[PDB]
Structure formats: structure tokens, C-alpha cells
Structure 1
Amino acid sequence: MELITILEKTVSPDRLELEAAQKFLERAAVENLPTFLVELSRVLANPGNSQVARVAAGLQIKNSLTSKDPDIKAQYQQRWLAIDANARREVKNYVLQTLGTETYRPSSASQCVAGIACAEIPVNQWPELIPQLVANVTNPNSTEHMKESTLEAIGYICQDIDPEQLQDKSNEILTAIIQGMRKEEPSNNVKLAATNALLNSLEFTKANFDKESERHFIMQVVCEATQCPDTRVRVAALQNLVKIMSLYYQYMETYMGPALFAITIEAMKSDIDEVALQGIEFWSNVCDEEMDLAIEASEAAEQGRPPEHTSKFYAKGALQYLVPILTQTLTKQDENDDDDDWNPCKAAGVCLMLLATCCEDDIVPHVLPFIKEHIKNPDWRYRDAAVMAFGCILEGPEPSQLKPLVIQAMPTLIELMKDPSVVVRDTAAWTVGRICELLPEAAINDVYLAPLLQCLIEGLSAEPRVASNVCWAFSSLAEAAYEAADVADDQEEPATYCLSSSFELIVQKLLETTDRPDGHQNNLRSSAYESLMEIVKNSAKDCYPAVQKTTLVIMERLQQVLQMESHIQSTSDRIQFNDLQSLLCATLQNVLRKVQHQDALQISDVVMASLLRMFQSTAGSGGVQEDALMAVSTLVEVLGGEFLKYMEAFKPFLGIGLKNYAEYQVCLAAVGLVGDLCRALQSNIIPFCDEVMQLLLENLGNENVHRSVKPQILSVFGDIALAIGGEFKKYLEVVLNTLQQASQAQVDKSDYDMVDYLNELRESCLEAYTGIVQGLKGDQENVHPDVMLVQPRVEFILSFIDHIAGDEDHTDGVVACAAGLIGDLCTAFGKDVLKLVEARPMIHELLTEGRRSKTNKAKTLATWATKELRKLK
């Protein structure tokens, strides 16, 4: 009937009544979307209607124009732009006019304004928008609601909108935001909305920050805001200071001394946890930026050039005053622990850690004294703090300075493992684990190993929060022991090592831990399996007897879960069966490694048989899960060509994994598996290639596929080409053009989330061409010549390389791949390639850069290629 009546029914607590209402609206939007929106906006815009109907209308509008789904979003945006400009004009008028006329707390108009703006701004279709929003805020006669709802609108636009679209109007946006944050502003609500919008907006105030006049204006408003009496504004302002430090570190030098240091140190000492957390994050974030600057400085030095950005070492300068604040905060442990909850105490530990790795040696002498003062304090809060701080500084300082300190700490640390406080024992295990990780020499000592091992063994039976760190400590100890034994001096793998004596007890104790009923708490079970896994890998040969037993137990468990999965009762059951299967399979990826290949075979056939059964039952019931595919890969690695026996049966399950493109993670694993099948089955994969190749190309048509699938599919094209050689001619044309296009992709660096998808995908392209050029040519030939079909493409591939050489943005993985390709071309097409290569000086420069190593063999490939071009002379 009436739109309003329907709208009010959408909030009914009755399922059917809520269904009728929703279907009415659905088909209305299908029968005449333009007229539906206009009517909806009229409801929203009229204060005469009930709050329920206005809010409901706002929701119908917003949902017609956006969605979390990027693809559906862009689609809704285009459906909007195609509507009569006059109808859209009317909707824009009403939505805009609703701002400030809502009694509702959070405005429903803000999100509609943003939804339409995100569509219309990139094509200048709503020139009226910005200047209207700016007027709403700056107008001294505007009500609190008008200003608040508007600032939220601004915020939603900066957040949802394409990043490239909003710089031409940053000047106006900032005028409104800054005006809304001024301290004279009577309403904290307005200040809060304004400050939240600033945060969303910083991404495009680049041109504004480059102007001292404006930069100075912005910093004063944010700093003053950190003094607002409304805690919500204080926190939001600090959040802005943190983001400003990440994007405009270059400009900060004039504000740190005179403002920021004091503001953020005061925030850290605040009794309001929300405030302390922002002060701490500010100084953890400075550590991150400065560690990144040090890498930039270091790389620029090896290039005989000064770095583009320089560090002012603020962490180093602040360190004196940071540490005493942070150690005290470590004293505020939350007695009821929640390994999923964040508080000042935990943030302080991370911050201390980052300071250790940022300022390295400097830090020791500021922390030690607190540690020695409190290591034996009767108050557990201080005893634990002391042990925590000790573990936080084990990475960063020169190991030569830490060793003596760690060795003299062992006796006390071993005792603390038996401390009456569970909180203390939790930290002792972590600190012990981090000693083993970072400074194993202290633990692999003829003095302390025996008693340390006794503590760790007993600790596996302790409470979850303690046993979990103990597990990690054990695996770390195992890795070190293994390495120590076989740096060298014996040959292929080590005959014995310091853990051999108790290897049996450890595995059985770990196998027990895996099975504890409270295993779900504190990530125990996973930690136990990770540890078992890591210790089986890192074991000496005189440990085989224990290794085999453990493998019989793992298969036993795996065989069990697998058949449990052809008889599922519930989606809870469904979920846990896969979680155990996941851990067991991952564990399998190390045991199969590490037996006799003869035995690995008997195990492989048995497991694959069980998985195929699980596949036959499990899925089409939500299946295929991904770790099962990775499980198959390791299984294909062992059976190699002997896997051909299961192809006819596995084939469909390969497909379903390839076809499933919505779960790019499953698809991805399916793609990689195809590559593994190529190297294993080789030529024998031919009779399967059509099906696969067809599914691959299909997927490439595209684009709600994930970014990340394409490069892998391209890489696999190369493998397929290597595996079937001449038989690839069938696909040659379509693939080359696909490569052609993907080569021309050229995202512009102001972004980095693209700079290293560009390289991820470029490398992929190079591996593709390499597999094709080598696939069509030859080993023990009769004559050669399929490759000649690609001959006409040489000019372009070289251009693609030349363009890669100019871009300072080289991943070593790419330089190498590009070098290997050049060498391939020389060996394939010969002395015509020379003229083309000497016509691009940048290619010469690319090879030299590869003749210096990073990595290893980028240098070999670059060395090889340089040689091939030389011999062509």
C-alpha cells in the first residue's frame, strides 16, 4: 500500500511481517528505481514523519548505492549514474536538505550523501555538494545537529571515496573540518565529528601540508584538541597526531620539541587507559617509521646516493623518558587475563620491544636497573614486570653485550619457572623462549640445559597460558640445538645432538599436550602441534626410532579425522574436524619430509586414499578446504610421477578447487597444485591440460577475482608450457596476448600496495614467457623451431624489460626473472636479440644491478645472461 506503512514494518520483530515489507520494497526498486528513490528521499527529508520511517527510508537509499562488496558497489554506482539526471537532481536535493533536521542520534542522511557522492564526484556530477557542506559547518548560525551530521557526511566521503578523487577539493574539505574542531566550538559532539573526519581525510591533504601557513594551522588545532576536556576528543586528536607522524614525518621536526613530546608523554602517564594507549602507540609508531628510515638510509648508502627521506632519531632522543614510563606500566597487569584483550600493560611491552630493536644498545642501561631492582620483589606485579622487561630487550642490542647478562640471569629465570604466581611463570616461559630464539648459546650450555629441560618438560602440564609459551620455547630450543650440531661438522644431517637424550620424552609429552581437553585455551593445541612439527623436523638421525613412532601416531590421528568427516552430524562438528585435519595435515608436511622415501611412499598412498574418500563424501557439502589441497601437494612431492595413479580420481576435486574463485585462497592453492602436478607428471599431464587450461583462462575473465590469482595463473601457464612443450601451440595465441596486456600494467607510485602487486605480477609475466620460450624449445631436438612462433614477440618482451629497468622499484625477484628471460631469448633467437638489447641502455644497467647480490642468484641469472649476450658478439 503506502510506502510509509511498509517502511515502518521493516523493524517488526516478526519474521513474516518483516518479509512482506522487504519484498514489497525489493520489487518497487525493480519496477521503477528512479521513482522509488525520489519517494524515499521525500520520506527521509520530512521531519513530519516518524523516526522509524525516516531511518528506514535512509537505509533503503544507502543500500541502493553501495555495499561492502567492491564489485556490487561499483555496479550500484553505475546504475545510479544511468538514471535521469532530473530524478537524481531531486534525490540529491532532499538528502542534502535532511542534514540537521533529524532528532535521531546518528544521522541517516550522512551515509546517503556519501553514497551518492562516491558515484558522482569522479565525474563532476554534483558540483553543488562541497560548497553546501562547507557552508553548513562554517555558518555561525548552524545548529549542533546541522554541523554534526554534516561533518559525519564529510567523514564518510573521505573514507568510502576513491582515493584519487578528493585532492582538488581538499582545500574546501579542510576549511570545514578545521572550523569544526576549533576549541571555541561549543559542542564536543561537533568537535568529535570534525576530528574524526580529519583522520579520514589526511590521505589527501598532501598539498596542504606543504604550506607552512596551513600546516601550522592544522597542527595547532589538533594539538589544542588533545587538551579538550572530552576524553573522546582527546583520543581522536591523538589518533590524528599518530597518523600525521606516519604521513608527514618530514615536517614533524618543528613540532616535536615544542609540542608533541610533552603532549604524548602526558598521555602515556594518563590514568585513562584509552588515552595512555594513544600515547604509547604514538611512540611505537615512531619506532616503526624510524626503523624503516634506517633501512632506506642503509640501502641508499650501498647505491652511492643520499636517501630521499632522513631520520631525526626521535625515539633515541625520547628514550630516557619513555622507558621509566613503560616499565611502570608493565606493573599494571590485568589479573583476569584475556589473550584477546588489549590494555596499556601489553602495549607497553610491545613498545619496549620496538624501542630495543629501534635504538638497540642504547636501551640496555635504561632498563637493566629496573630489572635488577625488582627481579626479586615480593610483589608479583613488579616481579613479573622485571622478567617481562628482560625479555623485551633481547632483540636489538649487540648479542655480545646480551650473552653475559643472559647467562647470569639463568639461575633466577629457572627458579621463576616455579614461581607461585601463574602470571610470573607465564612471562618466565616467554622470556626463556626468547632466549632460546635469540641467544641459544646460553641455553645450550653444559650447565643449564639439563635443569632448563626439566622445567620445560614439567611446564607442558601447567596452565594453558604457561604451557603454550613452553611449547614455543621447546621448538626454539630444538632449532638451536639442531643448528649447533650441524653448522658443520658433519655432513648431510647431524648424527646426534644435545636433545637426543630426551627426544623420546619430549615427543610423547608433546603428543599428550596436543590432546589435553583444555587445549582450545590460549592457542595450546596449535602451539603443541607446531612444536611437535618443528621438533620432528629439527632432529638428529639417532632420533629416528622416536620419529617413526610419532608418525604412526599422527597418521593414526589423521586417518581417524578423515573417516570422521564422511559422517558429520553438525556444523560445529564440521568445523572442528577440519581444524584438527588442518593441524594434522600441516604436521604431515614435515614428517613425510623426514622419513625414508621408501616409507614416505607407503604413507602417501594410504593418506591420498583416505583424502579421496573424504572428498567423495565431504564436498559437495562446502568443500574443498584448501589445506587438503596443500596436503595433496606435499603428497604429490613424494609420489612424483607415481601420482598419475590418482589423477583420474582426483581430477574433479582439482576442478572444484580451480572453479571456486570466490575463495581465492582455495583457488590459489588449486593453481599452485597444478604447477606441482606439471613438474611431477610432466609430459604425462597432457591428457588433463584442456580441462585445466580452460578453467584457468575462464577465471582470468575476471574481475571480481582477487588481484592475487592472476599472477599465479600466469606463472602456472609457464609450468604447463614446460610440461607439454609443443602441445602448447594450441594455447599459444591466447596466452601471449594475455601476457601482452598484463605486461602493459603500470600503476603509478604514490601507492605501495600497488608497487608490489605490480612486481608480484610482473615477475609472474616473466616466469610465463620463460616457461613458454623454454617449453617450445629444446633438449635432444629434431629441429627446433616452434619457438619461432614467438620470434615476432621479442621486440615487445624486450620493451617490457626495458620499462622494468627504468622503474627504480625493483624487487630482486623481478630483476632476476628479467635476467633469466634475457638469457633465454639469446639462447632461443640469437644474434638479432643483440641489436635490440644494445638499443636499450637500461637493460645493460639492469643486469649489472643483478650481478650484485641480493639475492643469491639474481646474481647467477644476471651473470649468465650477461655472458650469453657477450657470446652473441
Structure 2
Amino acid sequence: MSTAEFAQLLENSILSPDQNIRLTSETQLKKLSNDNFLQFAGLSSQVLIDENTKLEGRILAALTLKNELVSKDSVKTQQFAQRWITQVSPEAKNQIKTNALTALVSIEPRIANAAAQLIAAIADIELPHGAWPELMKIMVDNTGAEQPENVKRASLLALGYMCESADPQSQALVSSSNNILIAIVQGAQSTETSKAVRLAALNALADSLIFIKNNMEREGERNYLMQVVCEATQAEDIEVQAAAFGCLCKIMSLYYTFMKPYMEQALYALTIATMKSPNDKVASMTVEFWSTICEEEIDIAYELAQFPQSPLQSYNFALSSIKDVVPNLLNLLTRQNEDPEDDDWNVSMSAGACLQLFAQNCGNHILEPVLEFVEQNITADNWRNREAAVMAFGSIMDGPDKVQRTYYVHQALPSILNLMNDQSLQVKETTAWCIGRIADSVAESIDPQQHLPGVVQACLIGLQDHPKVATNCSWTIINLVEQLAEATPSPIYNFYPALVDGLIGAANRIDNEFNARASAFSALTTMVEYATDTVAETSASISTFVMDKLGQTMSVDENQLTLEDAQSLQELQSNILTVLAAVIRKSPSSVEPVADMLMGLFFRLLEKKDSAFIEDDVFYAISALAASLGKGFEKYLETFSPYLLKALNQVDSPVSITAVGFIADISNSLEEDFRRYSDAMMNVLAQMISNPNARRELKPAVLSVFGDIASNIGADFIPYLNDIMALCVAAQNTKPENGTLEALDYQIKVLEAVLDAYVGIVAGLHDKPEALFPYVGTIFQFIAQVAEDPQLYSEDATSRAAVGLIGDIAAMFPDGSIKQFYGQDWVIDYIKRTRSGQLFSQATKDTARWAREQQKRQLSL
């Protein structure tokens, strides 16, 4: 094939309006990437530099090559990397790299950009292996003083892209961090004519910061970088200014420990002075700088409480600066958007957020300046000042001590509730939020007789106001109820009928503008969840309403709906279904007569042409109906089964995770009438986890439902025991697929599922210890991971379950055949931590006592 006809092949694969030409070209290209990757990659690179091929064809060549080298799927990235390494000759790789570097210098920024991404993808693969030694040197060369502006810019973009796409824990970019910094500092220095080069250099700098820790440990290099970034804040271009403050933020975020000298010599005064900048975004960046300081200092204070001996150490920057920073935060609150419906982020929102962080970090120290400003401005004639006063007051409701907050709530609450009558939409919106902050953080300060009637009334007024106010009032009512339903004389239930009535009115508005209708439905979910036998009449009001409202949506001809109304109907039904599921669950008492009617609607909803959007919500309501009926659900199983088996096998769709949740629901609701579907469910589940096309969230879901099945079928599970235990072992030994926070949190989810599997299996087999024996050591390996990993043990339910397994396995083996596991220090000590752990519940402590008693029994044997 020639360059020209490979170009035409790419253009056809999407840029052709014939669908059939498209599929054929797509397919031919895939065959080509598979049969001869060398030639595929080669031709891509020479289409990219072909000055005779049209722009988008050259750009396509780069981005389609890049997408054959690099992926967000870990196994695919590992596969693409091995293909490039083994299937392409070093000589061909050389030409492709050379071509990518030629395209990088294109005077056409769109070409130089796609080349930048491609260079970064090749670097991803090659730098870890020490292939491409020339690259970092070329990047230093390309950013050098004498280079064209475009060469400098595109090279900084490439380094930028390199740093982004690299694994955050990788060693390649760390080992060449000097040359990364040289190139970046060459573009970011004030000696540079181009605002585009400086911006690119500072943007690349932010991306590089994690990889330059070795340069940051050296005083001379750290001093020089800080000098460069500070000088950049003094640039005439205001985009360069924000980017430099952006770097200062990130640097503070990652290198807090080196910041004291720079704060003292330059940064404290600089950042506090440009807080007064007329440029919203620059003023925002300095506010974010201080937000970062607070965040760092809050984390340090939490580290000296978790591990009281710890190395790290606060410098109390925020606390020292209150006299300068806070008054500047207060003035910035008055920079709200003129349009009350504008929503877009601005410095006044940055300030509010920073002020909240200052209250959390600095505590009672924040009180004096803020309360002053609140008193000064709550009765002011400018709406900007009255809204700023309520923002400021709501911002200090978390942090100061309980005695201070309770006192100032008492003083201020009447004047705050009066502001619900204000003529400014902005004031009322913020007032509604401030009441929710009071309710959420200082609920005890709301006297049931003195304050609560007025608080309820204000929420009722706001639900009837503009949607922006109504949305905040719903979330406030949620806070109110969540907080005041635990009280021993609980006063919130007296207001249930009127609150529920206001929410029903609000859920009934014409649309969901500013999320006011959806808010009201969520609030109704809370009302249903928290209801008591005392408020059955008003709980029946909600159920009547949502049934009524569901039947109204289903009579609509969807064919006739506009783009906006289609979107709006979908989400309304979603909202209705969510409350309905809660109703079914909270009160399985009213459920069995309407059950044939409910299921008739749910099936109809699954036939509804746009069922994809609501099928999740429908499945969740069916699940709730199942749990409510137990055996009474079985009659629906044969008509529902077709839908269920289809959803289960949609392994790349979130409905399959919900469908697994359904098996968990019926196994628990039928439990031993469940035995007869169990073998067939086991086979289906084994194929769903074997499937490569599976959504990642499904592995945890499938592993957990094995525990539910085992729990409910008991000794019948034994033939499946070895297969399931092998999936759990392989799961518990799987490390994070990379160094990101997302891969880590997924590892934790898998481990939490393995725990659920072990819990179910032990319970189902508690009368069959011989079957479980060979796996006891493996279950203790997993327990040792819970005791070692903080993201596991510090979780109440995870610790209760793990220590519950310790004690249950003990009771299961009174013969002393596993007693050696029970004389281990780690086991004894982990039991003691769960017993003591200040932030564990009394159910978690009782479970640890039980494991301790069982453990002591084991030592006697």
C-alpha cells in the first residue's frame, strides 16, 4: 500500500458518509494492524508528515496510531506496549519516531498537537525500557532560546502530555526529571517573548510536579524553580499569571514541607495582595492557593491524630494569616454574578469555599472577623452584601466549637429566617443553604419550640419560590430530617404532614429547572426512609402520589416528545421509581395487594422503547418488590426471567450489576426456596465473570453474590466451594492495576467483595466445618490484609465482618485443629483495636468481644 491510499483508507473509516464504506475501511485497517503492525504504524507516520495529504487525514493518522499504542484499559495498554516492542523493528520504530518529531515542528498547530500526543504515547512504552535516549535531549534542544516559537510550544506540550499519561508512580520520568525541568524552565522564564510558550511551559510544569521530587529536594534547584514561577505571576498576560498561581497551588499541594522560606520571603505577601486583583480568574487562583494550604494543614492535623507519632508537621500558615486573608475572602464574596441564573463558577464561590476551609482548620479563630462582617452586612441595602453575610455565616458552621456555634445560631437565626422574604433571588437561595448548614452541623441549636416551627415554615416558603431556592430548601429538609430523627423526644415528626405536603407540591412543578423537582423527589425518598408508625397517613400520601405520578408519565406518547421533554420525562420517571422502590422497602405491608399491578407497570416500563435509561431504576424497584414478597414473588419469575437473563448478560452495562443485585435479593428472600434456582444461577454467574467484555464494577458484584447464594443454600454450595474459593484467592492477591487512586479504590472494592463472599460461605457452611477446613489459612491471609490496610480496618462494617469471621471460624473448629492461628500477635492485637476503636459502633465492639472469647477458647484447646 502507498501513503496516499492509506490516507484515503483513514478518511473513509469515519469521514465518509456511506456507512458501508465505513465498516469495510474500519475492518481493513484492523486486519492491517493485526497482520502487519509495522506497516500500519509506518504508513500512519508518513501520512502524518505528508504535506500533500489534507490536514484532518494527517491528524487522523496520528490519533489512530496513538490509539493503537495507548489505552485506558490496563490489559490493552500492556498488549499494545508488547506489540510495539516485539512486532516493530528498531529501524521502523526509528523512522516512526523521527516522523513524529518532524510533525511536531509543523507550522500548523493542529498537526504539531496530534504529533505531541503520539510522541507521548510512544514515550509511555519506550522510556521505561530506556529505548528513546534521544528524546529528553531533543526536548531540551527544542525549547532552547534560539528555537522558533512553534518548536518551543509543541515540545512543551509533548512533555506536558508525557507527564499526564505516565503512571503517577513510574520511575522513567523521575530518572529524566532534570531534562524535563530544564526544558520547562527554558520556556517559563521571563526572557521568553511568547505568551503561548510560557503558558505551555507552566502547564507542562504542573503536569511534571510529581516526577520532579528529586530536584525539589535540592535547595538550589528548588529556589530557582520557585523564583521562575513567582516571576511568572508578574507577567503582563493574565493567562500566564493564573497558570503561575496554578503552579504555586500544585507546588504547595505536593511540596508543603519546603514552603516556609518561600512564604516568608515572597509568597505570603504576593498571594494576599493579588487577592485584590481585578481579574476574576487570577484572584480565584490565589484563593485556591490558600484553600490548598488549609487542606494540607487539615490533613496534617488528622495525621497527628491517626498516627500521633507521625513525621509531618504544620506551619500554621492559615492560622497566622487570618488577619490578612480572611478580610480579603469576605470582600470577594461580594463578586457574585449579576444574573441570578448564571451558575458559572467565579471568585466569590472560591472565597466562600476557602472561608469554609479556614473555619475547619482555624476553628474559633475565624469567629471574630466573620461575625463582624455578618452583622455589618446582613441588613445592608445592597443584595450583594446581604447574600455575602449569609454565605459567610453558613461557611463557619463547621469548625468553631459547639458552644460558640450554638450561641451565634440562637442570635442570628431569626434574622436569617426573615431573609427568605428578601427580594433578591441570590439572597434567598443562599439563605436556604445557610439554614441547611445550621441543620446539618448544629441541629441541637434549633430549639424544637423556639426555632423549629420557623425553620420548617421558611423551607415551606422556599419550596414555593424560584427553582433555585426550592432546590436548596429540599436539601435543607433532608438535613433537618436526617439530623432530628435520632432525638429521644423527636420533634420533626410533628412537621411531617406539612413538610411532605410542601415537597409533593414541589415535586409537581412543570419541569426540573435548576434540579428543583429532582431535589424534591430525593427529599421524599428521605421522608419515606425516616417515617415512623406514627406518620403512616403521610407515608401513605407519598405512595399514593408516586403511583399517581408514575401512571401519568406512562400515558405520554414518547414519539411526540421534544428533545428537552424527552430528557425531562426520562428523569422524572427515574425520580418516581427511586421513591417507589423506597416505599416498597419501607412498608412491605401495603405491597402484596398492589403486587400484580406494580409488576404489570414494571414490565411495561421494560418494553418502553427508551427502557435503557430507566431499566436500572425498574430493576431496583422489582428487586425491592422481591424482598417484600419473599415466596410470593416466585409467580413472576417465569415472565421476568427473560428480562433478567438478558440484563445479566449485558456485562458492559450497569443494568447487569443491578441484575446481580436482584439475585442477592431473591436468595435472601426465598433463601431455601432459592435452592432450586441456585445451580442455574451459579452457571450464569461463572460465565459473567469469565467474560472479558465485562464492566469492572461487576467483578465485585459477582463475588459478593456468591456469599449470598452460599449463605442461603448452605451445604448444597459445597460442590461449588473450590471454584469460588479460587476466584476469591486470585482476587485477594490481585494488586492495583496501576498507581492511580482509581485503581486503588477498585482494589479495595474487590477486597470488600471477597470479604462478603467469605462471610456468606462461612455462614452457609457453619454446620459443615470439614468442607471449609482447607481454606481457613487462606481466609486468615485475607483477614491479615484487613488488619494491615487502613482503607479496610477503619471501616466499621469491614472490621465487624472481619472480626466476625475470626470468631465464627473459631466456634466452627473446637477440636484445636486451627488453634495456632489464634495465638498470633496480629490476631490478638487486631481484636483489641476493634474492641477499643473510638469510631467503631457498639455492634462492632460486641462482635470483637465474641471473637476474643472464641480466641481465648482456642488457646485452652
Q: TM-score, normalised by structure 1?
A: 0.89
Aligned twin of 2:141: 135
Match of 2:794 in 1: 812
Alignment of 1:764-783 (within 5 A): 764-778=753-767
1:37 aligns with 2:41: yes
Alpha-carbon contact 1:178-1:194 (below 8 Å) kept? yes
Partner of 1:491: none
Matches within 5 A, 1:578-657: 578-595=570-587, 597-615=588-606, 617-618=607-608, 622=612, 625-657=615-647
Q: 1:756–1:817: structure 2 CA closer, same or farther, 3 Å change rule?
A: farther
- Alignment partner of 1:692 is 2:681: yes
In 2 relative to 1, CA 399–770 (structure 1 residues): closer, same or farther, beyond 3 Å?
closer
Say if 1:729 and 1:274 are closer, same or farther in 2 by CA, change over 3 A.
same
| Offset of residue 367 of structure 1 | 0.8
Greater displacement, 101-110 / 234-243: 101-110
Is residue 115 of structure 1 aligned with residue 121 of structure 2?
A: yes
**Matched ranges for 1:832-843 at <5 A:** 832-837=816-821, 840-843=824-827
After superposition, residues 301-316 of structure 1 pair within 5 angstroms as 301=308, 306-316=309-319
Deviations 1:474-533 (A, max 9, x none): 34444555444xx14xxxxx6xx4663x6444433322221222x321111012222333
Deviation at 1:459, TM superposition (A): 3.0
For residues 411-453 of structure 1, give each alpha carbon's deviation from its aligned partner in whole angstroms, at most 9, with x where no partner exists.
3223322222222222222223333333345544534444554
Structure 1 residue 293: deviation in Å? 1.9
**Post-superposition shift, 1:33?**
4.3
The structural deviation recorded for 1:384 is 1.9
Q: CA separation in 2, counterparts of 1:14 and 1:749?
A: 35
1:845-872 residue CA offsets vs partner (Å, 9 max, x unmatched): 2222222234124333322122112213
Query: Which whole-Å CA distance do the structure 1 matches of 2:471 and 2:613 have between them?
Result: 31
1:460 shift after superposition? 2.5
Distance 1:793 1:536 in 2: 43
Q: Does 1:535 align with 2:527?
A: yes
Aligned length: 847
Name the residue aligned to 1:512: 505
Question: For 2:640 and 2:556, how far apart are their aligned partners in 1?
Answer: 20
> Cα distance, 1:741 vs. partner?
1.4
What residue is the counterpart of 2:267 in the other structure?
260
The 1:543–1:849 alpha-carbon spacing in structure 2 relative to 1, beyond 3 Å, is closer
Residues 8 and 56, structure 1, Cα contact 8 Å, conserved in 2:
no
Q: Kindly tell me: are residues 661 and 575 of structure 1, through their superposed partners in 2, closer, same or farther at Cα, counting changes over 3 Å?
A: farther
Question: Which SS does the other structure have where 1:462 is aligned?
Answer: coil
Bigger drift between 835-844 and 194-203 goes to 835-844
- Is 1:387 aligned with 2:390? yes
Q: Distance in 1 between matches of 2:540 and 2:250?
A: 54
Q: What CA distance in whole angstroms lies between the structure 1 residues aligned with 2:293 and 2:718?
A: 55
Post-superposition Cα deviations, 1:60-92, rounded to whole Å, max 9, x if no partner, equal: 433443456666555544443343313222211
Please tell me whether residue 284 in structure 1 is matched to residue 291 in structure 2: yes
Answer with 700-709 or 562-571: which moved more.
Answer: 562-571
- Matches of 1:17 and 1:765, distance apart in 2: 49
**CA distance in structure 2 between the aligned counterparts of 1:42 and 1:88, rounded to whole angstroms:** 12
Shift of 1:566: 9.3
State the partner residue of 1:726: 715
Matched, 1:171 2:170: no
SS of match in other structure, 2:113: coil
Return the letter of the residue paired with 1:405.
Y
1:567 is displaced (CA, Å) by: 8.2
Percent sequence identity over matched residues? 33
The change in CA–CA distance for 1:83 and 1:464 in structure 2 (over 3 A counts) is same
In 1, the alpha carbon distance for the partners of 2:529 and 2:100 equals 63
Question: Residues 402 and 736 from structure 1, CA distance in 2 versus in 1: closer, same or farther, beyond 3 angstroms?
Answer: closer
**Are 1:204 and 2:194 an aligned pair?**
no
What CA distance in whole angstroms lies between the structure 1 residues aligned with 2:554 and 2:679? 31
User: Counterpart of 1:712 in 2: which secondary structure?
Assistant: helix
Counterpart residue identity of residue 430, structure 1? W
Q: Which residue identity does 2:773 align to in structure 1?
A: Q
RMSD over aligned Cα, in angstroms?
3.3
Q: Residue 289 of structure 2: SS of its match in structure 1? A: helix
- The reply to whether residue 458 of structure 1 matches residue 469 of structure 2 is no
Q: Which residue of 1 aligns with 2:779?
A: 797
- Please tell me the residue identity of whatever aligns with 2:589: Q
Task: Provide structure 2 residue ranges, at least 5 long, that are not aligned to the other structure.
Answer: none
Change in Cα spacing, 1:525 to 1:703, as seen in structure 2 (3 Å) is: same
Cα gap change, 1:330/1:644 in structure 2, threshold over 3 Å: closer, same or farther?
A: same
Give the conservation status (yes or no) of the 8 Å contact 2:507–2:521: yes
Query: Residue 157 of structure 2 aligns to which amino acid in structure 1?
Result: E
For residues 134 and 2 of structure 1, do their structure 2 counterparts lie closer, same or farther at Cα, with a shift above 3 Å needed?
Answer: same
- SS of alignment partner, residue 108 of structure 1: helix
**Structure 2 partner of 1:659:** 649
AA matched with 2:644: L
Identify if the C-alpha distance between structure 1 residues 3 and 708 changes in structure 2 by more than 3 Å, giving closer, same or farther: same
Counterparts of 2:660 and 2:740, CA distance in 1: 28
Q: Cα–Cα, structure 1 residues 232 and 833, in superposed 2: closer, same or farther, change >3 Å?
A: farther
Paired AA for residue 257 in structure 1: E
State the distance in 1 between where 2:95 and 2:384 align.
64
Superposition map of 1:428-507 within 5 A: 428-441=431-444, 443-479=446-482, 482-484=485-487, 487-488=488-489, 497=491, 500=494, 503-507=496-500
> What SS class does the counterpart of residue 801 from structure 1 fall into?
helix
CA deviation map 1:240-276 (0-9, x unaligned): 2111222222222232222222232233211111111
Query: What amino acid does structure 1 have at the position aligned with 2:579?
Result: T
Q: What amino acid is aligned across from residue 613 of structure 1 in structure 2? A: R
- Kept after mapping to 2: 8 A contact 1:436/1:480: yes
Q: Is 2:832 the counterpart of 1:848? A: yes
CA 17–620 in structure 1, closer or farther in 2 if over 3 Å, else same = closer
After superposition, the Cα gap between the structure-2 partners of 1:755 and 1:274, relative to the gap in structure 1 and judged at 3 Å, is same
| Aligned counterpart, 1:245 | 252
Deviates more, 1:438-447 or 1:394-403: 438-447
CA contact (8 A) 1:47 1:101 kept: no
**Residue identity in the other structure for 1:640:** G
Alpha carbons 1:66, 1:76 under 8 Å: kept: yes
How far did residue 580 of structure 1 move? 1.8
**1:823-851: per-residue Cα shift (whole Å, max 9, x none)?**
23222233444443156432222222222
- Cα distance in 2, alignment partners of residues 540 and 789 from structure 1: 45
Q: Is the 8 A contact 2:518 2:572 kept in 1?
A: no
The residue number in structure 2 matching 1:299 is 306
Change (3 A) 1:795 1:51: closer
* Change over 3 Å in CA distance of 1:10–1:731 after alignment to 2: closer
Distance verdict in 2 for CA 1:836–1:756, change over 3 Å: farther
Q: Which residue of 1 aligns with 2:237?
A: 230
Distance in 2 (alpha carbons) for counterparts of 1:237 and 1:51: 33
Query: What is the Cα deviation at residue 278 of structure 1?
Result: 0.9
**Would the aligned equivalents of 2:332 and 2:348 in 1 still touch at CA under 8 Å?**
yes
Match of 1:821 in 2: 805
Contact kept in structure 1, 2:481 and 2:492, CA below 8 Å: no
Distance 1:195 1:652, change over 3 A: same
Which amino acid in the other structure matches residue 536 of structure 2?
Answer: Y
CA-CA distance at 1:113 after TM superposition: 0.9
Change (3 A) 1:328 1:570: closer
* Residue 161 of structure 1: aligned partner: 166
- Relative to structure 1, the CA distance from residue 864 to residue 29 in structure 2 (aligned partners, 3 Å threshold; closer, same or farther) is closer
Change over 3 Å in CA distance of 1:703–1:833 after alignment to 2:
farther
The 5 Å alignment of 1:369-384 reads 369-384=372-387
Instruction: Check 1:763–1:415 CA distance in 2 against 1; reply closer, same or farther (3 A cut).
Output: closer
| Superposed displacement of residue 735, structure 1 | 1.0
Counterpart-to-counterpart distance in 2, 1:609 and 1:801:
46
Structure 2 length-normalised TM: 0.90
Give 1:410's aligned residue: 413
> What runs of 5+ residues in structure 1 fail to find an aligned partner?
489-493, 779-783
Alpha-carbon separation, structure 2, partners of 1:36 and 1:748: 29
